[PDB]
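Appendix B. Chain record.
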Amino acid sequence: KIEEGKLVIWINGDKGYNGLAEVGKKFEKDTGIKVTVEHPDKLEEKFPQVAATGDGPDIIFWAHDRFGGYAQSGLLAEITPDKAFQDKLYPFTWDAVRYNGKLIAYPIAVEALSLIYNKDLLPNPPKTWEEIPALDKELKAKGKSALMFNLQEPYFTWPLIAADGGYAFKYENGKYDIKDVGVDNAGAKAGLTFLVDLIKNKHMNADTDYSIAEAAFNKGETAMTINGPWAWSNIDTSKVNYGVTVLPTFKGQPSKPFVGVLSAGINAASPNKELAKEFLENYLLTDEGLEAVNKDKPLGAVALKSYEEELAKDPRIAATMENAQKGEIMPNIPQMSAFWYAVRTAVINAASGRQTVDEALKDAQTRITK
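Structure tokens predicted for this chain:
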């Protein structure tokens, strides 16, 4: 068991693997090479294990952030799309699949948080974070609040914290400078301070989590929420007349949500790399390939410019892409684990009064660059 003359692909069960299996039938038609799609349990855990022994699938699909650790252990083949193929995708997407200068995967789909609002409570969404407090006082007059989102996890608060200058790790060449951390600058300080002021001025509760904000928006109790494409199906059900738009600016700067990129990487151990690259570049990364997959399960915004332009007729998808273009690609390096825990702590601490903003961030900065 170690491939040879066929293709085996691994993709999560929550994706359009039936559509991907259909691109595969088309490939098997003009080639005779059979493609096999599977969606094993915790495949992102299983991958590292089987690949380390020269086993596993030829190709694996997962968010880009996980690819950094895989690449580190030499589990992924270096890819070499030519200039021409490269120009078919949004430039920023190639930055997500670079591991110390080397291209280690093809970008497929893009995901980023967006501002979700209730069209019945709010005519036009606010363009600015600075105007939320005032809006909240007007909505409170009717027993409604302006905004509710998950305050517990930094993934959700980062857009605001980063807006005016924060960043996880300085990136400038397909490479991340791990001693250039941006959680303690004035930028991040301005952002967290604004957030803290929201909670103390009672425009927001420090204990709002994922579940609470979600139920609140879905019950029409709050005018806005911050969430991703995975949340749409729940709102639909709710029967709320919602819109998806660009996040608000802060100090005139765009909010900077982290961007996750659904990526396809080739097993360094596969004997079929040429077959993989041909399947990927000429079957899958085409309007017809993305379409067959999308038909099975939506991909959200896609990296292929041509198909994205078709998809963007859905204003929710257009907004997703817009936010993503203004966001921060999530670093694929191992030091990112330090960032999660540190920044998680800094925010809960500053929010609960347990520490000041200056203190909370100084500490987090310290634990990351430690």
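Further analysis of this model is presented in Appendix C.
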